């Protein structure tokens, strides 16, 4: 039974032998086998009592269970609670991930499962390498288990040991003559993972095993990755690999200096200048067969600089920090192209710093260029749009003007990103549908915040027309949330979430200007949700009729003038007069009620319950449907 | 000055012009080649709906003329259950 | 200076508001 | 401001009568709209004769009784006067 | 309690009322600890006192705490006091009218659109029943404010 399953789970959790023995006996065989071969749903996650016994290092109770019964370790369970909680793993997987050697050895001694394959085909060796215990890895290797198991993206245990700090695990893995040239899905052959966390010993061990250098899928060498991670030690080690040439040395120094120019943890402008001057000196070190810096066309977002082709211009900007950071951004963009994953993360950091230092217009340009690059890369830029809305609301709250073409550009980019988000949501059925829908709702909320900011900015007539065109384009795809909420519903609802940043000071929902702009852009005023509520149904449920009576009056006037039905019904057959829950909203709706004979006739038809099917025009059938 | 509404049973329903101008298709029927600019009949035909729905439509016209802005407590319009689903189609056809 | 009356606080100083009231 | 309905065997008129008014005004307007002299016209309301222009209230209708939702039926009698031969409207069909 | 309600420190007054203080604390001027909160627009303090049921009583100047809240242009506390479920209608009409009046002429709060909308809402709520119409009693016109005689109708408003 489920209660008996909980009882035996609690008995096995405390590591008590006699309590579990008294709760796993005096019964038949089928119930006992069900008890020892099922998971218990604890805290929203299903887990075997053996899992919770191995997690606490209760080796005696599970050993006596193996002695007194024939319980197997092949039970399907989760992996860990560290942001994964995916099922399919065996009990030996969590035993190896629990950092307890004795439970692993007793599970191996009775029905070893060293070659378990989950949905991600992760062996217990993966969990042992994640834990970082040498003895468990050694015993699992001695248990005749393959060490060359590659996942769907080729998650080799050597790669995940190089990513972690366990140099002992990776050195034991390479001591068995494992292949270091293991290709991954992204082309990372275990050196990009090694030289990303600044593991000098792991990188030295892999270079000792001659892991070789190959450019991955993103067009980056492992040395370029090392320079990207702001780790000088691994760069200095890789520069002595004897196969680097002149082309990949000065560019690696420039990439390291650019990474040091704009980073959160590692921000040293003097180190950046020293590395840049060293790279410039190494370029102009002989005078013959000179390796000149390639000159990209100037970019408006990065000021108006034209790189540093000379040591003189590099020297003159030693005391000017922002020009140095712009130069670092320029050389990073030149080296890494317009296709790297982390190409805009230093740009994001610099924009955040600029906003924190009240430098806004340059921050706006930098974040606009970063958004353009990320949209070129086709990634989830919901957080970038959230930052856009936050900085725009901060500028508005600080009584600072906002450039209308910038608003139009970020609105159009957000519209396109919402289009691809809708395409992804349509494509995604059940893999990450919750995350996709959360990003969908976040994109909708950010668009609403941007619209609210745009309503509070003085803009040109052409700029206003372009913004209205963008809003028209977004509405004419009809985005919807989980509970059928259109964009108009979100602009009318009082329960629309507002971000904890400066959006609270400016973007307040319900907002009359947002709804007026949406209806002037041709939003569907009669659109219903999953629950049948219209925009007029939600606006009467507003529980603050007098504090912001301006907002309520303007939005009801706009909804009625746009053509909302002041008499339609939801799925619960409730008129917004009846669903008004407020005297003021009821009175405003009654004042704005434009009565018609069709409405009264349909309401009397619905109230008296007359079968209207196949007796009315088809377009009138919908009229009976909501009236 | 007065609009003569006939029905399928030949019952006349002469009401005021301003009372009958609320319904759009009534205005359309009065316009076109049917002005009759001698303010004596202004008659229109209705060869598809019975007389009781015309009675209800005329009473609704007087209702709308009387109660269009008189406070906010609009009186309850009387609709019989049997005449329902016929006044609805008539109202849709009259765009009332 | 101008003509702006500083009496909006005087309408609220009639309640006993001070360090002691 | 009481709404009245005047019905012959076939035709029907919808008119509004002021509360501080008499029957003479409605007789005049029905004479104008029906080109018949007032003496020929008879207000056979509720199978009862009525006077010419004395008082609206004594005739049997008030503001609440002859509401615009459903004004009281007033039969018109003409000299050969005729009886109350008001032909009823068509019966609505029964419920499905 | 009175000064804590007047001041913005909601923690202090919430601790005082949680320590079983006096909710009906009369002052010399008649302000029963609700006017001090509903003079500075502290919505949370008024919420805390209503949770503790401080009760509504007319002060010395012939004003309810709702009246003071309407006088100080603070609309949110006016709403909260109207949602007390023991207010009747006449108090609601006069409170909305006073809120519009205070918004008409004040230093910190001056928004004439708020005045027009609040007076419109007051007139519509007043002329809601149709019958039993609550006609405004009007003082005779005073030469100081021009010669207007209020707005007894929504049309003239």
For chains A and E, CB pairs below 8 A equal 34
Q: What is the CATH number of the domain that holds B54?
A: 3.30.710.10
- Residue A452 known to bind ligand: no
Contacts of E139 (CB under 8 A, 6+ apart): none
Mutate to test the interface with E, among B69, B71, B75 (most CBs of E within 10 A): B71
Q: Indicate whether B58 belongs to any domain.
A: yes
Q: Do chains B and A touch (3 or more CB pairs under 8 A)?
A: yes
B/E interface, count of CB pairs below 8 Å: 14
Tell me: cis bond preceding A510? Omega within 30 of 0 counts.
Answer: yes
Q: Is B83 a member of any domain?
A: yes
How close, in Å, is residue A491 to chain E by CA atoms? Answer: 22
Chain A CB contacts of B79 below 8 Å:
600-601, 604
Q: Radius of gyration (Cα) for chain E, nearest Å? A: 17
- The answer as to whether B9 is a domain residue is no
Give Cα E121 distance to the centre of its chain. 15
Cβ of A597 within 8 Å of Cβ of B81? The answer is no
User: How many whole angstroms separate alpha carbon E109 and alpha carbon A291?
Assistant: 68
C-alpha to C-alpha distance for A206 and A391, rounded to whole angstroms: 44
Residue D23, C-beta contacts closer than 8 angstroms, at least 6 positions apart: D43, D50, D51, D52, D53, D54, D55, D56, D59
Sort out which chain E residues have CB atoms less than 8 A from A553's CB and list them. Answer: 117, 121
Any chains having at least 3 CB pairs less than 8 A from chain C are: E
CATH of the domain at D20: 3.10.20.90
Please, which chains are in contact with E (at least 3 CB pairs closer than 8 A)? A, B, C
Contact C15 E35 (CB under 8 A): yes
Q: Is residue B67 part of a domain?
A: yes
**Closest residue to C15, CB basis, from E29, E106, E107:** E29
> Residue A484: left (phi > 0), alpha (psi -120 to 50), or beta?
left
Q: Which residues in chain A are closer than 8 Å to D95, comparing Cβ atoms?
A: 610
- Structural tokens at position A518: 């949406």
Dihedral angle at the C-alpha atoms of A49, A54, A58, A61, nearest 10 degrees?
Answer: 50
State how many domains chain B has. Answer: 1
- CB-based contact, D85 to chain B, within 8 Å: no
Mutant choice from A546, A547, A583, A592 vs E, greatest count of E C-beta within 10 A: A546
E51: exposed, middle or buried (Cβ count in 10 Å: 0-12, 13-18, 19+) = exposed
Q: Which residue of D has its CA nearest to A613?
A: D96
B72, B74, B75, best to mutate vs chain E, most E CBs in 10 Å: B72
Helix A321-336 with A345-356: angle, nearest 10 deg: 160
Task: Say if CB A183 and CB A154 are below 8 A apart.
Answer: yes
Q: Is there a contact between B94 and A597 if contact means CB atoms under 8 Å apart? A: yes
The contacts found for A613-617 with CB under 8 angstroms, 24 or more apart, are A615/B85, A615/D96, A616/B85, A616/B88, A616/B89, A617/B89, A617/B92
CA distance E36 to chain A (A): 19
Residue of E nearest to C20 (CA): E3
Residue positions counted in chain D? 96
Best residue in E30, E59, E71, E107 for a mutation probing chain C (most C CBs within 10 Å): E107
Closest CB to C15: pick one of E6, E106, E107. Answer: E6
E89 touches chain A (CB under 8 A): no
**Header resolution in angstroms:** 3.9
Question: Which chain A residue's Cα is nearest to B59?
Answer: A597
Contacts of E19 (CB under 8 A, 6+ apart): none
With beta carbons less than 8 A apart as the criterion, state whether A93 and A124 touch. yes
Q: DSSP of B56-71, one letter per residue?
A: HHHHHHHHHHHSSSSS
Say if the Cβ atoms of A617 and B89 lie within 8 Å.
yes
Interface membership of A610 toward D (CB under 8 Å): yes
Residue D1, min C-alpha distance to chain A (Å)? 21
Count of C-beta atoms within a 10 Å radius of residue A286: 9
Contacts 24+ apart (CB under 8 A), E90-97: E90/E134, E91/E64, E91/E66, E92/E125, E93/E122, E93/E125, E93/E126, E93/E134, E94/E67, E95/E66, E95/E67, E95/E70, E96/A546, E96/E70, E96/E121, E96/E122, E96/E125, E97/E122
CB spacing of E127 vs B70 below 8 angstroms = no
Closest-CA residue of C relative to E33 is C15
Please check whether residue B44 lies inside any domain of the structure: yes
CB < 8 Å & 24+ apart, contacts of A495-500: A496/A445, A496/A448, A497/A445, A498/A449, A499/A386, A499/A389, A499/A390, A499/A445, A499/A449
Helical residues (DSSP H) of A431-511, grouped into ranges: 433-455, 461-475, 487-492, 503-506
B78 in a structural domain: yes
Neighbouring residues of A23: CB distance < 8 A, sequence distance ≥ 6: A4, A7, A8, A11
**Chains touching B by CB (3 or more pairs below 8 Å):** A, D, E
Chains D and B touch (3+ CB pairs under 8 A): yes
By residue range, what is the domain housing residue B36? Answer: 17-93
**Cα A80 to Cα A62: distance, rounded to the nearest angstrom:** 20
Method for this entry: cryo-EM
Instruction: Identify the three-state secondary structure at position D84.
Output: coil
Number of domains in chain D: 1
Bridging pattern class, strands D73-77 and D2-7: parallel
Q: Give the C-alpha distances (Å, rounded to integers) separating A117 from A94, A113, B13.
A: 13, 9, 85
Question: Chain D: nearest CA to A611, how far in angstroms?
Answer: 7
User: Which residue do the tokens 């609105």 mark?
Assistant: A411
Nearest-CB residue to B72 (from A590, A605, A624): A590
Q: Tell me which chain E residues have a C-beta less than 8 angstroms from the C-beta of A584.
A: 121, 125
User: Which residues in chain B have Cβ-Cβ distances shorter than 8 Å to A613?
Assistant: none
- Contact of B75 with chain A, judged by CB distance below 8 Å, is answered with no
D26 CB within 8 Å of a chain B CB: no
Q: Does D96 touch chain A (CB under 8 A)?
A: yes
| Burial zone of A593 (CB within 10 Å; 0-12 exposed, 13-18 middle, 19+ buried) | middle
DSSP characters for D19-43?
Answer: TT--HHHHHHHHHHHHT--TTT-EE
Q: Which alpha helices (H) appear in B1-96, and where do they start and end? A: 17-20, 24-30, 51-66, 87-94
**A495-507 core/surface letters (b: 16 or more CB in 10 A; e: else):** ebebbebbbeebb
Identify all chain A residues contacting B81, using CB atoms and an 8 Å cutoff.
604, 608, 610
Q: Is residue B12 part of a domain?
A: no
Contact A601 B72 (CB under 8 A): no
Mutating which of C16, C19, C21 best tests the E interface, going by the most E Cβ atoms within 10 A? C16
DSSP 3-state percent helix, strand, coil across chain D (nearest 5): 15, 20, 65
Asked if B2 contacts B42 with a C-beta cutoff of 8 angstroms, the reply is yes
Domain span including residue D42: 1-96
Do residues B20 and B63 touch, judged by C-beta distance below 8 A? no
- Residue written as token pair 């009356």: C5
B69 within domain boundaries: yes
What is the rounded CA–CA span in Å between residue B10 and residue A403?
70
Would an 8 Å CB–CB cutoff place E113 in contact with chain A? yes
Contact E93, E133 (CB under 8 A): no
C-beta separation of A527 from A568 below 8 A? no
Given a contact cutoff of 8 angstroms between Cβ atoms, the answer to whether A623 and A598 are in contact is yes
R_g of chain C computed on alpha carbons: 11
The two three-digit tokens of residue A54, written as one number: 């191995």
């Amino acid at each position: 039974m489920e209660g008996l399953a909980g009882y035996v789970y609690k008995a096995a959790s405390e590591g008590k032998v006699l309590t579990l023995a008294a709760l796993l006996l005096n019964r038949s065989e089928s119930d006992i086998r069900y008890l020892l071969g099922y998971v218990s749903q604890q805290g929203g996650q299903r887990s075997t009592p053996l899992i919770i016994a191995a997690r606490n290092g209760h080796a005696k109770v599970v050993r006596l269970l193996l002695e007194h019964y024939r319980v197997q370790t092949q039970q399907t369970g989760t992996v860990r609670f560290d942001g994964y909680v995916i099922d399919g793993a065996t009990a030996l997987w969590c035993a190896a991930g629990a950092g307890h050697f004795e439970v692993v050895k007793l599970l191996v001694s009775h029905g070893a499962n060293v070659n378990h394959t989950t949905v991600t085909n992760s062996t217990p060796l993966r969990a042992a390498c994640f834990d970082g215990r040498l003895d468990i890895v050694k015993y699992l290797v001695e248990n005749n288990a393959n060490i060359s198991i590659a996942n769907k993206y080729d998650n080799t245990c050597l790669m995940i040991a190089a990513y972690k700090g366990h140099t002992d695990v990776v050195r034991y893995l390479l001591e068995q003559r494992a292949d270091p040239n293991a290709k991954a899905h992204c082309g990372a052959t275990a050196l990009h993972f090694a030289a990303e966390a600044g593991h000098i010993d792991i990188v030295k061990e892999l270079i000792k095993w001659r892991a070789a250098i190959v450019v991955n899928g993103h067009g980056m060498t492992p040395l370029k990755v090392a320079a990207e991670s702001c780790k000088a030690d691994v760069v200095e080690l890789l520069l002595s690999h004897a196969d680097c040439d002149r082309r990949s040395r000065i560019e690696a120094l420039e990439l390291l200096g650019a990474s040091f120019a704009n980073d959160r943890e590692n921000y040293d402008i003097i180190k950046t200048y020293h590395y840049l001057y060293l790279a410039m000196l190494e370029r102009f070190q002989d005078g013959d067969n000179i390796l000149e810096k390639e000159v990209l066309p100037p970019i408006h977002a990065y000021g108006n600089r034209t790189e540093c082709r000379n040591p003189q211009e590099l020297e003159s900007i030693r005391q000017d920090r922002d020009a140095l950071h712009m130069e670092g951004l320029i050389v990073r963009e030149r080296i890494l192209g317009a296709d790297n994953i982390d190409v805009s993360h230093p740009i994001i950091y610099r924009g955040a710093v600029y906003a924190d230092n009240m430098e806004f217009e340059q921050c706006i340009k930098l974040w606009l260029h970063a958004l353009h690059l990320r949209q070129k890369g086709n990634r989830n830029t919901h957080k970038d749009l959230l930052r856009f809305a936050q900085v725009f609301s901060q500028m508005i709250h600080l009584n600072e003007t906002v450039k209308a073409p910038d608003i139009e550009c970020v609105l159009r980019c957000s519209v396109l990103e919402i289009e691809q988000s809708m395409n992804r949501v349509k494509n995604i059925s059940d893999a990450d549908v919750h995350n996709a829908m959360d990003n969908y709702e976040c994109n909708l909320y950010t668009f609403l915040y941007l619209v609210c900011i745009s309503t509070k900015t003085q803009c040109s007539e052409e700029d206003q027309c372009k913004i209205n065109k963008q809003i028209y384009n977004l509405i004419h795809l009809d985005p919807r949330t989980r509970e059928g909420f259109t964009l108009l519903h979100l602009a009318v609802n009082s329960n629309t979430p507002v971000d904890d940043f400066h959006t609270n000071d400016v973007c307040s929902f319900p907002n009359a200007l947002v709804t007026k702009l949406l209806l002037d852009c041709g939003a569907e005023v009669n659109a219903v949700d999953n629950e049948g509520n219209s925009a007029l149904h939600i606006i009467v449920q507003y529980n603050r009729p007098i504090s912001d009576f301006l907002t309520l009056h303007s939005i009801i006037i706009s909804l009625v003038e746009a053509g909302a039905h002041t008499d339609m019904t939801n799925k619960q057959n409730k008129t917004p007069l009846d669903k008004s829950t407020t005297g003021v909203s009821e009175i405003l709706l009654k004042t704005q009620m434009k009565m018609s004979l069709k409405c009264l006739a349909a309401r009397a038809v619905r109230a008296n319950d007359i079968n209207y099917q196949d007796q009315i025009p088809r377009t009138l059938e919908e009229f009976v449907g909501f009236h | 000055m007065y609009v003569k509404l006939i029905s399928s049973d030949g019952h006349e329903f002469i009401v005021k012009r301003e009372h009958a101008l609320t319904s759009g298709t009534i205005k359309a029927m009065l316009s076109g080649p049917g002005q009759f600019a001698e303010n004596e009949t202004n008659e229109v035909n209705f060869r598809e709906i019975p007389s009781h729905v015309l009675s209800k439509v005329c009473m609704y016209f007087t209702y709308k003329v009387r109660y269009t802005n008189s406070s906010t407590e609009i009186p309850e319009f009387p609709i019989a259950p049997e005449i329902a689903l016929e006044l609805l189609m008539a109202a849709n056809f009259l765009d009332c | 200076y101008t003509f702006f009356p500083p009496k909006k606080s005087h309408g609220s100083c009639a309640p006993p508001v001070s360090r002691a009231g | 401001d009481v709404f009245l309905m005047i019905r012959r065997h076939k035709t029907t008129i919808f008119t509004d009568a002021k509360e501080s008014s008499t029957v003479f005004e409605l007789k005049r307007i029905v004479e104008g709209i029906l080109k018949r002299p007032p003496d020929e016209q008879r207000l056979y309301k509720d199978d009862q004769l009525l006077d010419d222009g004395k008082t609206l209230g004594e005739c049997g209708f008030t503001s609440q009784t002859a509401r615009p939702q459903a004004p009281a039926t007033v039969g018109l009698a003409f000299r050969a006067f005729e009886a109350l031969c008001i032909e009823p409207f068509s019966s609505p069909p029964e419920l499905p």
